[PDB]
Ligand binder design. Structure first.
Ligand SMILES: [Mg+2]
Ligand SMILES: [Mg+2]
Ligand SMILES: [Mg+2]
Ligand SMILES: [Mg+2]
Ligand SMILES: [Mg+2]
Ligand SMILES: [Mg+2]
Ligand SMILES: [Mg+2]
Ligand SMILES: [Mg+2]
Ligand SMILES: [Mg+2]
Ligand SMILES: [Mg+2]
Ligand SMILES: [Mg+2]
Ligand SMILES: [Mg+2]
Ligand SMILES: [Mg+2]
Ligand SMILES: [Mg+2]
Ligand SMILES: [Mg+2]
Ligand SMILES: [Mg+2]
Ligand SMILES: [Mg+2]
Ligand SMILES: [Mg+2]
Ligand SMILES: [Mg+2]
Ligand SMILES: [Mg+2]
Ligand SMILES: [Mg+2]
Ligand SMILES: [Mg+2]
Lengths: 117, 106, 65, 88, 52
RNA sequence: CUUGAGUCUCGUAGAGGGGGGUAGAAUUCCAGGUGUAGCGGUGAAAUGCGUAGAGAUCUGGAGGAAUACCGGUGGCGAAGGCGGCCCCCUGGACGAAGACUGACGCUCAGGUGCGAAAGCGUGGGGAGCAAACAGGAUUAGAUACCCUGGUAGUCCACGCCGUAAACGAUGUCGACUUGGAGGUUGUGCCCUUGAGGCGUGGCUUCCGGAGCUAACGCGUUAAGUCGACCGCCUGGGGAGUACGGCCGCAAGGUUAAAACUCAAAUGAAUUGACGGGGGC
C-alpha cells in the first residue's frame, strides 16, 4: 500500500526453522514470512520445501510494495539456504547479489554442552 | 636508548590542528635529546573499517629514540587528545630511516 | 612459495599492504602456510604484521566490517 | 639482565685483570648485583614465580661459589664478603 | 547475467570459506582435552596415511 | 692441569612469567526505528517467551568473558601449564668464534618452594555456560540421558586447599652402541650470486637394525651396554581403611597397620564366539 522503490531480502535460517524478511536498505521491515507459518510444524517446519513455500509467501505478502531489485543476505547453516534464494527469485525478483552474513564469534562465548543420544 | 615507531591516526575534522599537535610531540623528544630518524605524512587514507563511525582518517608516522619515561608521557598525552583515535607505539630493534612503503607507493 | 627467502627480506612490514593483501582471503582470513608455501619463521611474522595492520585499520578483520 | 656497562664495571673492579672474567670474585659479584637488583622486581611482582625460580638459581650458584672460595682461601673469602656485605 | 550459475558462485565462496562447518563446530562446547585428542587423531591418521 | 661445571663478549627463536593498556567478531540485556504472528524447542512434543508487539530487521548504548583463521606433524616452560595486538619489569634455552675460573661436580632422606580442576574464607564482578534446584517429557519405572529455565560456581583481588589416568602409566646425571625419512632452530663454507649444493650444532616427530623384553613392544630422545645417587614393590580382597601423630577454617590430605578371608587376583598374546563395530 506504499512504495519504497527497492528492497533487501534477509533469509534468517535455523536448523529448527527458516525466516524470510523483505526490508528496505534502511533496515525497516516491509514484509515477512516464516517456514513455520506456512502450515508446516515440527519436522515439516524444517525442510527445503517449507522454506520454498515461505519465500513465495513473503514475496506475495510484500508484492503490494512493488519491490523489484533486492539484495539477498542469508544467515544460518540450516537447510533451505539456497532453496529460499531460488523460490524468491520467482515473481521476477531481480537479484543483485547474495552475501553470507552468518554470525562467527572469534572464540567469544561458551556454547551449550554436547548432547548425549 | 630505545627506538620506537609511532603511527597515530587523527580525526579528519582536526587535520588542520595536526601540524600544531606535532610540536609538543617533537618537543618532548628534543628536550630529552632524543633523536628522530623518520617523519612521514601519508595524509587522509580510506579506512578498511569505521572508527567511531569515521572514515578518511589522517595517518602520521614517527620513528623516535628517547628515554622510556618520555615515551610513556607521550602515550598519556595521546589518550588525553580527542582528535586522535588510534595510537600505536612499537619498539624497533634499530632506527629505520628508509622510505615508508606508503610514501614509496604515492 | 617462501617468497620471503628468495628476496631474502629479513623483516616483514605491517605497512606494506601490497604484500599483506596477497596473504589475506576476500573473507579477510589469513591464508595457511600449507597453501601459500611460506616458511614457518615468516608465516609467524606475516600473522603478526597482518594483525598489527588490522589494528591500524589498514586491513579488514572480516569481509563485512 | 645486567647492562654491559654494569657488567664490565663489576668485572674490572673485582677482576685481578680486566680480561679476567671467570674468577670466583667476578662471578659472585655479578650474582650479587643481579640478586640485589631483582629485589625491586619481586617487591611489585609477588606472583612472578617463574622468575623467582631463576632468582633462586642465582642465590644457589652464589652459595656454592662462596663455599668453594671459602675452602680455597679464607683471605679472599673474608675480604670479598666484607666488600659485598654478605653473611653479615 | 544468469541467476543459475550466479548461485553456484555462492556455493563456492560459502563452502571454501567454511562457515557452514564453523557453525556446526561452534554449535556445542568441545572440551580442550577432546580438542587435543581429536587433533592428535587427525595428525596420526593423515600422517601415517602418506607412508603406507 | 682443563676435557666436567661455571663466567664474559655477539646474536637468534619462542602462547616462558608478572603488570598495565587496548582493539575487532560474537552472545546477552536496555532504549528505540520499521513490521505483524508466531517464535523457540524435539524422536515427536510440551513447558517456555509473544498482540503491553515477540522473534525477524536497522540504528545507538551498556556490560562481562573469551581471543575465528594464523595454527602445525609448531613453539616455550622443572612440572602444573602458556595463544589477538602494544608497552613495561623479567627468567631460561641455544649458537658463533675466542678469552677467563680451575673439579667449584652429580645425586639427595628430612627440609623448602611451585603445583590442573573442583572446593573453602573475605571483598568484588557476573554476558555466556551451568552442579543443586524448578518445571516439560521419555519410561513399567526415570530421583537419569532429552527440553525450557536456573543458583552456587566459572571471572577479579588477597589467603587457604595440595589433590588428578598430575601419564611417556617410563626418577635424575653421565659415557658408549648400525641406519632411514621428517619438522623446528641457529650457524661455517662454496658455487657468479639470487635461488642453490655441501658441513656442524639445539630441540623435536615417525619408521626400523643389533640387543633387550613374557609378549606387546622399546630401539642413539632405549625399555640396549654401563656407572653414581634417590624413591618405591613383596599374592588378591580387607585398605590407601582403621588407630595415633602432623597439617587444614572446613572439606579433607599425608604417614600407615592388623584380625579375618580366598587359592587365586593379574600381564601380554592366541583360537573361536559375540558387538545396538566396520568394510566388501
Ligand atoms: Mg541447544
Ligand atoms: Mg645470564
Ligand atoms: Mg608472551
Ligand atoms: Mg519493542
Ligand atoms: Mg621444551
Ligand atoms: Mg623430599
Ligand atoms: Mg579453581
Ligand atoms: Mg569463591
Ligand atoms: Mg561471592
Ligand atoms: Mg540443562
Ligand atoms: Mg541455558
Ligand atoms: Mg558450598
Ligand atoms: Mg596433563
Ligand atoms: Mg604414578
Ligand atoms: Mg641417558
Ligand atoms: Mg620403532
Ligand atoms: Mg638406561
Ligand atoms: Mg622391562
Ligand atoms: Mg595382602
Ligand atoms: Mg585417609
Ligand atoms: Mg587421622
Ligand atoms: Mg587380555
Amino acid at each position: 500500500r506504499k512504495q519504497v522503490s527497492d528492497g533487501v531480502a534477509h533469509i534468517h535460517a535455523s536448523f529448527n526453522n527458516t525466516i524470510v524478511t523483505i526490508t528496505d536498505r534502511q533496515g525497516n521491515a516491509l514484509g515477512w514470512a516464516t517456514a513455520g507459518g506456512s502450515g508446516f510444524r515440527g519436522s515439516r517446519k524444517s525442510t527445503p520445501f517449507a522454506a520454498q513455500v515461505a519465500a513465495e509467501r513473503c514475496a506475495d505478502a510484500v508484492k503490494e510494495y512493488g519491490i523489484k531489485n533486492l539484495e539477498v543476505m542469508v544467515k544460518g547453516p540450516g537447510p533451505g539456504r539456497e532453496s529460499t534464494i531460488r523460490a524468491l527469485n520467482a515473481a521476477g525478483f531481480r537479484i543483485t547479489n547474495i552475501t553470507d552474513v552468518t554470525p562467527i564469534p572469534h572464540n567469544g562465548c561458551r556454547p551449550p554442552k554436547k548432547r548425549r543420544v | 636508548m630505545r627506538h620506537y615507531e609511532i603511527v597515530f591516526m587523527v580525526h579528519p575534522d582536526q587535520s588542520e590542528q595536526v601540524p600544531g599537535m606535532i610540536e609538543r610531540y617533537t618537543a618532548a623528544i628534543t628536550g630529552a635529546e632524543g633523536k628522530i630518524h623518520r617523519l612521514e605524512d601519508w595524509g587522509r587514507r580510506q579506512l578498511a573499517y569505521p572508527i567511531n563511525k569515521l572514515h578518511k582518517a589522517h595517518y602520521v608516522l614517527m620513528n623516535v629514540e628517547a628515554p622510556q619515561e618520555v615515551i610513556d608521557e607521550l602515550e598519556t598525552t595521546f589518550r588525553f587528545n580527542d582528535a586522535v583515535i588510534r595510537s600505536m607505539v612499537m619498539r624497533t630493534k634499530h632506527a629505520v630511516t628508509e622510505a615508508s612503503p606508503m610514501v614509496k607507493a604515492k | 612459495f617462501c617468497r620471503f627467502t628468495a628476496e631474502g627480506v629479513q623483516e616483514i612490514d605491517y605497512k606494506d599492504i601490497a604484500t599483506l593483501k596477497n596473504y589475506i582471503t576476500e573473507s579477510g582470513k589469513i591464508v595457511p602456510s600449507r597453501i601459500t608455501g611460506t616458511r614457518a619463521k615468516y608465516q609467524r611474522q606475516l600473522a603478526r604484521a597482518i594483525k598489527r595492520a588490522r589494528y591500524l585499520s589498514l586491513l579488514p578483520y572480516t569481509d563485512r566490517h | 639482565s645486567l647492562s654491559t656497562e654494569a657488567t664490565a664495571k663489576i668485572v674490572s673492579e673485582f677482576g685481578r685483570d680486566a680480561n679476567d672474567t671467570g674468577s670466583t670474585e667476578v662471578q659472585v659479584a655479578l650474582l650479587t648485583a643481579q640478586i640485589n637488583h631483582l629485589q625491586g622486581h619481586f617487591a611489585e611482582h609477588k606472583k612472578d614465580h617463574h622468575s623467582r625460580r631463576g632468582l633462586l638459581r642465582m642465590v644457589s650458584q652464589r652459595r656454592k661459589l662462596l663455599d668453594y672460595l671459602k675452602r680455597k682461601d679464607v683471605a679472599r673469602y673474608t675480604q670479598l664478603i666484607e666488600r659485598l656485605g654478605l653473611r653479615r | 547475467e544468469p541467476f543459475d550459475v550466479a548461485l553456484r558462485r555462492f556455493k563456492r565462496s560459502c563452502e571454501k570459506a567454511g562457515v557452514l562447518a564453523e557453525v556446526r563446530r561452534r554449535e556445542f562446547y568441545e572440551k580442550p582435552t577432546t580438542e587435543r585428542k581429536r587433533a592428535k587423531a587427525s595428525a596420526v591418521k593423515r600422517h601415517a596415511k602418506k607412508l603406507a
